[PDB]
Symmetry: C3
Subunit: 227 residues, 3 copies
């Protein structure tokens, strides 16, 4: 016997609560959709025990920023700016004015990485530096540059696992926390890599892409990695 | 030469009709979306020859229930209640009043499984008992409990294939039909597992997750398993 | 450390521009959605340097056709008719009247393939013939029929890679360009198959399914295949 299953798109709140009960504390959240559902998700994360929250919104007015901050006032809120490496002193103030605990800045080259780190740290913001996939030697140099120029944490979207291990190992040398993702929608591949990352860098968190997985499979993935 | 393909989301009706022509008779349908498209899908399933239909709606008023029943009056309609293991005698009547041939009940523990089976069977409803993924010994005990307490069929959302084979083998011992799914979006992995499930339990149906696959690939998957 | 990532759906324009900068020139675009976002995507493809554009719309009025043609007047626009193998002389005129450089026609059997090729070529349209997955010998005969009856190019939606290689090799014998896809959402499997297709047929383009992949991973996929 063979049949068809048309599985429904599960609410993100259910997935957030299921993971947090197992002990998950970090969620990287896309905040480009409508405000009402984004705020609702953040509130559920706050109730579930999510202590580290990384928003990735699109255009972000100060109204949106305060709404997100108020949706989880006791969490470590990090606002990711997106794509454009330009960092005007105005948008820094808005993220600062809303109570964000940190700002997320992409790293295309190192010269703008140093300038952005100077701008945001001078304005009292902790900085989470993100690296785009690239050659292994270049990524290592950017990890060192981010570390030396005062980054609080590293965001690694490196689907090349071997390159990612290299960057994570360099970050561990500097005692840099790492948020790692990329190419992890399979359950079995994730739990294997979650054991490897832990050995390379104890301060490193691996992110499961949870948008398309069933809640039960997320629980299975988190159970096998945490335990 | 390399290029980009932005494939469009295909209507579920096309996929239902394509599978039914090959001989597929069981469809597990998410019924959380708008009523008009859900009813339209059910009607196409009725025209295509779908004889076993498992709805998984969200909130479900009696108006929705009768609409679904009338969309395919000659099919074996099973209404799945969702998540909350509480089973009030009122929602049982509504599913009964609408002409549903069976009700779908989750099994978190065995004590509420026995109580829910008593409640629904006393009210003349056939019961399809669903099992969440868990330890192999626990799943087997729940299969035995469901079988002994009068379940008409088992729903297995077990992504751990080896555990799923264990539950399916225990169900075969009791002559229990099984609807099985979980982690089957790949074509090649599905057809392999479809041959294994058949040997373990002739009364067992394996469900292909069809939400993201092309219609041609669904036809290829069903052709290789049925033949 | 383990966490959740809820990645946002990235605009198709970003993916189109990222690929075109690497040198990609062919995009197969679903044109069933609203006109405004479809036209916006086509314009971005025109600006990015996409010279071969294959639209796959649903119902298509002449208003839609001219809008798409005007969104990229310097590109080789191919309009794919969809599913129904019937080819009335009226819809041929509308595609012709809008300035389309070619028409896409499915091939269920060979007799309607010959008739449709006669109809569209007599009306001055270049024809891109698409083949549905099937037995290896049948596909080869259809490639020969399409080639002998005057097809300008072949569209291959063959998830069975070995069958696809057979059709591509037969097309190379006749000097037929090929657009190939099917089952390519994984990065590593795509780049491997992109090297094999090139050897079999230099005039053959392999399409990456880009709807669900991150822009960075698309860049990684295109970099490894082009170089």
């Amino acid at each position: 016997g063979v049949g068809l299953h048309f599985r429904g798109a599960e609410p993100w709140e259910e997935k957030i609560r299921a993971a947090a009960e197992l002990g998950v504390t970090t969620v990287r959240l896309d905040a480009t959709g409508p405000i009402e559902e984004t705020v609702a998700r953040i509130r559920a994360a706050a109730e579930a025990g999510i202590t580290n929250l990384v928003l990735e919104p699109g255009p972000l007015a100060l109204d949106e920023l305060k709404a997100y901050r108020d949706a989880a006032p006791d969490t470590f809120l990090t606002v990711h700016i997106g794509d454009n490496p330009v960092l005007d002193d105005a948008t820094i103030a808005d993220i600062k004015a809303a109570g964000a605990d940190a700002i997320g800045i992409p790293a295309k080259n190192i010269d703008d990485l140093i300038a952005n780190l100077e701008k945001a740290k001078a304005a009292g913001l902790k900085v989470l530096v993100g690296l785009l996939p690239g050659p292994k030697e270049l990524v290592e140099e950017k990890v060192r540059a981010a570390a030396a120029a005062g980054a609080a944490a590293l965001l690694l979207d490196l689907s090349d696992l071997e390159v990612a291990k290299a960057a994570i190992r360099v970050a561990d040398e500097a005692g840099l926390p790492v948020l790692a993702g990329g190419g992890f929608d399979d359950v079995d591949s994730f739990v294997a890599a979650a054991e490897e990352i832990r050995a390379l860098n104890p301060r490193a968190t691996l992110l499961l892409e949870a948008r398309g997985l069933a809640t039960a499979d997320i629980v299975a993935a988190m159970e096998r990695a945490l335990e």
